[PDB]
């Protein structure tokens, strides 16, 4: 089986995940919502950007009532940004959970504060997408976030051309365990080649052991032939997630330049002496757990 | 055809309806919306829980950009969950009531009445005239009241509820605008409302409106197939009066345990000198 150090590593990651992933989104509050009764190549790029990831929004009340928001079609105007303030609040809530996740890991808190900042900058979106996938319903095409749900709107082959959507469907198909998800989070978090990382050697050694632990876990708990090459598939998915991260960052900067919507914590993570430019990140890392 | 006096009578009513009926609800704004996320008391809440379950409707908002917000009410599960839409309905009812007050105000036959009778008539008829106006935006094929960008959609079981049976039966008559506005006048000028002093004057005015409606139908729908349309209209008015009484007692029971009525609504339904007990109504009539 697994070595006792690998067992302890998985248990610490899983403990951290449980403590910092509010999978019922019960503490996501005070978010913005679309109002009730509401250069050319750059706009053309932005309009193609937003239409790819088009979702409707549903809020179930504690009483059993339901509010449902259907987004407008693109009529060439500011109507395509109606959901961005809400998405900024949701992404910000997710990022805070990801920050708390890293803070609980012993190997992360032992790193210098500037490397903690640079790793969180490099990995925050990726870790958020990994968590979002665990609440993704591939049959209904909806992310189920507690009383909130985000449903992709109607074909499906065309939708899969959007890399972010293809990633979520492909990753869901692997039917990963919680332990495999959290090891993916650690491999992405401890990436030695993120910009600004000074302790690249210690990070690379850490990433290698998380990858070794993931491979050993898969060999210990998945005898079926449906899971052949599963470790390599997961590592390829992580490489793909890194590519999607870069495309998404460019997409956000294009939208933010035309229609600013990013919260102050997002502006820090996307870059819109390391500690001076990241007062919020610095603060959250000092507050501890 | 109609006599010149009947022609002018219809003209004033249609002019009144045109000036005071916001048929696209373009000026209904700033309304409330349901939140985004003992011994005899138990018998009171028991009767009230049944009352709200008859007032079950879905709600839709169509924004200018093409976005749509939709609200589906909860199922009855105790608690104020069954009260979630009462603030919105209070705002819609109050907006509609104000239009009815403006409607009566421009009618010369109404202005000539004493202010106390004007108050008494509006109290007795306001709800009825609101339902008559609501019938003209009711879509019988979809069960939806289309109020501009707002829609109220329901969700033989419904035909048992008198309010819904009323709206389907009235819509099936396919009345003209002139016939709706004469319906409103006949209901507004009811001599048998509580507190009416000039009973004989109001009765004579109602009869003239009814004769005008009867003559309108003979002249403009002479085909023998509309031979009893006037009597059908009068029967719908009688049924609407019955629904008005049922709605009032239902509103008072809800108000008693969960206050929701606006100040103007409190005056119209008698919730705590006829003028001094209706200061808002009096003000709206004096402007």
Author numbering:
A (entry chain B): 142 to 179, 195 to 310, 314 to 431, 445 to 461
B (entry chain A): 142 to 178, 192 to 309, 316 to 432, 445 to 459
What are the paper's exact sentences on this?
PXR is a nuclear receptor that can be activated by diverse compounds to elevate metabolism, negatively impacting drug efficacy and safety. As a xenobiotic sensor, PXR is activated by structurally diverse compounds and plays a major role in drug metabolism and drug-drug interactions by regulating transcription of genes encoding drug metabolizing enzymes, drug conjugating enzymes, and drug transporters. Here, we report structurally related PXR-selective agonists and antagonists and their corresponding co-crystal structures to describe mechanisms of antagonism and selectivity. Structural and computational approaches show that antagonists induce PXR conformational changes incompatible with transcriptional coactivator recruitment.
In all reported PXR LBD structures, there is no difference in α12 conformation regardless of the presence or absence of ligand; indeed, most NR structures display the same α12 conformation. The observation that ligand binding does not affect α12 conformation in crystal studies provided us with the opportunity to determine differences in interactions between agonists and antagonists to residues of the PXR ligand binding pocket under similar structural circumstances.
